[PDB]
Design a protein around this ligand. Structure first.
Ligand code: MG
Ligand code: MG
Ligand code: MG
Ligand code: MG
Ligand code: MG
Ligand code: MG
Lengths: 283, 296
């Protein structure tokens, strides 16, 4: 239906949880003017062969998630940062497109081009494989009987699907070159990093994007597992999702300090971006 | 505590497991038969791969390991016995790693042997996928041997524990080296996203944890979900065991929403592992000459 009856109160509740359990706030990243126009030229060229124009605003609404959800004071590689900017901006376009627009012969080569632009050969393969995996998953699951059984069964089945489908496993495998931290790289490559962060990212996104996706008939959203019309049932479900986030965040705190910073900045950063950006005030 | 145990439940739980498979999976697993030469080629490569680490391991101990691959693949659908033989070797030699003291973990010596196994049996693309998955598994296994992260994810809740096990039990590794056996596009994708590993983690881990609890508590190993409950309390053990059965059943029922070939493979893995586990030397007694701690 719509969660707007709950939008103000739940935002307060999220923020409360972050102030209390994470504390350390994210900060938005500054691109130099050379750096920015690299990113957007690269986005426009990637989508170009698919036939879709993309407004300047829209690229900017996409890129907000990367400007806000990395871990600035750890960043060691801005080419990898622009790689993630470009990969996550075009990832969004592919996500909004009707499947019959999804041309793999044309888009996959641009993904590889991007990865070979910004990464060394080992990382470029890792980033590209994960990009290929994300766009392919998104396509073969559109209105798929598997997606239906994973998103209507239980929260546990749903978040299991979202590890890949929300894009966090992709995120980690294209972001570890930014930090060159051996622990973070291995947890990225086992996908333990993605698994640790999946629920913090997905629960936030599902809440604020519930309106768009119900309007657009999309089922990949954990709040469809409850009756948002029932206010009691929503508030029980919301609290249970809140506890999911809290247990994840406490276990993340057992990771090494650099790794925990990236994980928590990712989760909190995505919350600040998701609320304040125009991508999720409308549809 | 010291010698804590699930021996009192051994009998009823194997029956609860079996009747769960009879109701929900139905198809019985089918053990791959290896001709006598394949079994000797496998074991021949296994020795070579672990030899730089400096421990002899017996044919009896190799064959104990390889039983999981013989029993838990999907012979209805196998197309590539070279990839199958790869999985036998790789799974067998990483079992040794999992059974070793970390002081014996030499990546510089062992990783080359993994790469040679993969290049022997796979084409170019597959060799790289199988190797990254093998390396990630022996690396994760080494690096969590004492980790505070292991203790965090294994003592907080079943959800955190199974999240750790997707990698640690080795099922992501298994999927990413098994997909060339089948040349099935859907299954290949599910392997590469780890969706396949994630769907089968609980069914493999719950079965293995029950039957290896006694070995692991004695060795002081903490990666086992039944440590999250009071197995001495009969009432607490039963609620817990029941909840893990529900976990298995929910996974199996969602697995049936995958295409028919893919779910055949998923269910043969879960059910086959259960047939191997409950009919093999490794899970007959806690310490014996196929599961004993390999030492420095
Ligand atoms: Mg979307
Ligand atoms: Mg989507
Ligand atoms: Mg959404
Ligand atoms: Mg073990
Ligand atoms: Mg293990
Ligand atoms: Mg075990």
């Amino acid at each position: 239906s719509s969660v707007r009856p709950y939008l103000e109160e739940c935002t307060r509740r999220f923020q409360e949880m972050f102030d209390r359990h994470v504390v350390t706030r994210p900060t938005k990243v500054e691109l130099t003017d050379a750096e920015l126009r690299e990113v957007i030229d690269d986005c426009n060229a990637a989508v170009a062969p698919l036939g879709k124009t993309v407004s300047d605003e829209r690229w900017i609404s996409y890129v907000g998630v990367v400007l806000w959800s990395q871990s600035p004071r750890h960043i060691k590689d801005m080419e990898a940062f622009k790689a993630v900017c470009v990969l996550n901006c075009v990832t969004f376009v592919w996500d909004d497109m009707d499947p019959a627009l999804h041309d793999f012969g044309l888009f996959l080569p641009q993904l590889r081009k991007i990865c070979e632009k910004y990464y060394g050969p080992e990382d470029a393969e890792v980033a590209y494989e994960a990009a290929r995996a994300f766009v392919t998953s998104d396509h073969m699951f559109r209105d798929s009987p598997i997606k239906a059984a994973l998103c209507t069964t239980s929260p546990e089945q749903y978040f299991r699907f979202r590890v890949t489908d929300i894009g966090v496993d992709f995120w980690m495998k294209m972001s570890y070159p930014i930090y060159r931290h051996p622990e973070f790289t291995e947890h990225a490559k086992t996908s333990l990093a993605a698994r640790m962060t999946t629920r913090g990212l997905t629960i936030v996104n599902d809440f604020y994007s519930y309106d768009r996706e119900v309007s657009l008939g999309q089922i990949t959203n954990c709040f469809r597992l409850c009756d948002v019309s029932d206010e009691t049932a929503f508030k029980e479900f919301f609290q249970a999702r809140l506890d999911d986030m809290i247990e994840d965040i406490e276990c993340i705190k057992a990771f090494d300090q650099l790794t925990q910073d990236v994980f928590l900045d990712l989760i909190y950063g995505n919350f600040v971006w998701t609320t304040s950006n125009k991508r999720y005030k409308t549809a």
